[PDB]
């Protein structure tokens, strides 16, 4: 029997990778036509897939970066259980395989990661794990901070063993609309091991600040209701990054490439401006 993604459709018709443990990962990739000057990789967050990045995906490869990305396991067109790891380090093991693939094709060109929320934890988990291999980060209201009152809570409850608002991930009503009838995106409760996954994702990202020294740029909104803002300050006061930059957007929410027009199109702006100095 052909293996399908968990919409039906044969991963023979899509392109894919096997992940360590043989899992199908979806992928998406957006190629310039001419040679590539960089590689970019994008991780997604929570609940969301790779096909979100479009439009930034479409500006990435206009400057001659070859865009690339999968769903992580649990999510959108991948194979696993709904929003379930094993533990959160494969994560970061499927980016770094598909990293080193795309490197072996495209060999002696930068590598950038941009990720967004738990895709951004895992862009510095990665960046970490192999200092010096990466040449950039772009972090969009990255997950770095967890309530101590939700880490123990989680931590009783899985001794033992409810959906966000989406109103909360952006001010624009038509991202909204956008995102609660993608179905791709998994809008459920949080697991409770996946929530312990979460809380591990955020005690490794602690203990990486003091070896993380990728040049970063760090987007955040200031009324963010999932990402508190004391988390960007926090990170960038605790990398060693010798190249560090934090953009506050007054205001908005969690979902910054998705927010109003004036937000989004400066998001876009900034991410250009950043990557293409550090492709010149």
């Given at each position: 029997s052909p293996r399908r993604t968990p919409?039906?459709?044969?991963?023979?018709?899509l392109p894919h990778l096997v992940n360590a443990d043989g899992q199908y990962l979806f992928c998406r990739y957006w190629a310039?036509?001419?040679?590539?000057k960089a590689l970019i990789f994008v991780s997604h967050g929570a609940?969301?897939?790779?096909?979100?990045y479009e439009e930034l995906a479409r500006m990435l490869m206009g400057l001659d970066l070859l865009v690339f990305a999968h769903d992580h396991?649990?999510?959108?067109?991948?194979?696993?259980?709904?929003?379930?790891?094993?533990?959160?380090?494969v994560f970061v093991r499927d980016v770094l395989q598909h990293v080193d693939s795309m490197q072996k094709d495209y060999p002696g060109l930068p590598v950038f990661l941009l990720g967004h929320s738990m895709g951004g934890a895992i862009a510095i988990l990665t960046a970490a794990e192999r200092?010096?291999?990466?040449?950039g980060m772009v972090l969009i209201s990255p997950l770095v901070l967890a309530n101590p009152e939700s880490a123990t809570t989680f931590k009783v409850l899985a001794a033992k063993v409810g959906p966000i608002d989406?109103?909360?991930?952006?001010?624009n009503k038509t991202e909204v609309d956008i995102y609660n009838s993608d179905?791709?995106?998994?809008?459920?409760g949080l697991k409770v091991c996946f929530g312990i996954q979460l809380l591990n994702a955020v005690s490794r990202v602690e203990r990486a600040l003091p070896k993380l020294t990728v040049p970063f740029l760090l987007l955040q909104g200031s009324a963010d209701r999932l990402c508190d803002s004391k988390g960007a300050y926090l990170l960038m006061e605790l990398a060693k990054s010798q190249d560090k930059t934090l953009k506050i957007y007054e205001g908005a929410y969690h979902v910054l490439h998705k927010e109003l027009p004036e937000v989004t199109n400066s998001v876009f702006h900034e991410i250009n401006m950043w990557v293409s100095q550090r492709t010149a």
């Open positions: 919409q039906s459709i044969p991963y023979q018709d310039p036509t001419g040679t590539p609940g969301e897939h790779s096909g979100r396991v649990g999510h959108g067109q991948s194979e696993g259980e709904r929003m379930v790891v094993s533990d959160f380090h200092p010096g291999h990466f040449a989406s109103s909360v991930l952006s001010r179905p791709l995106i998994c809008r459920a």
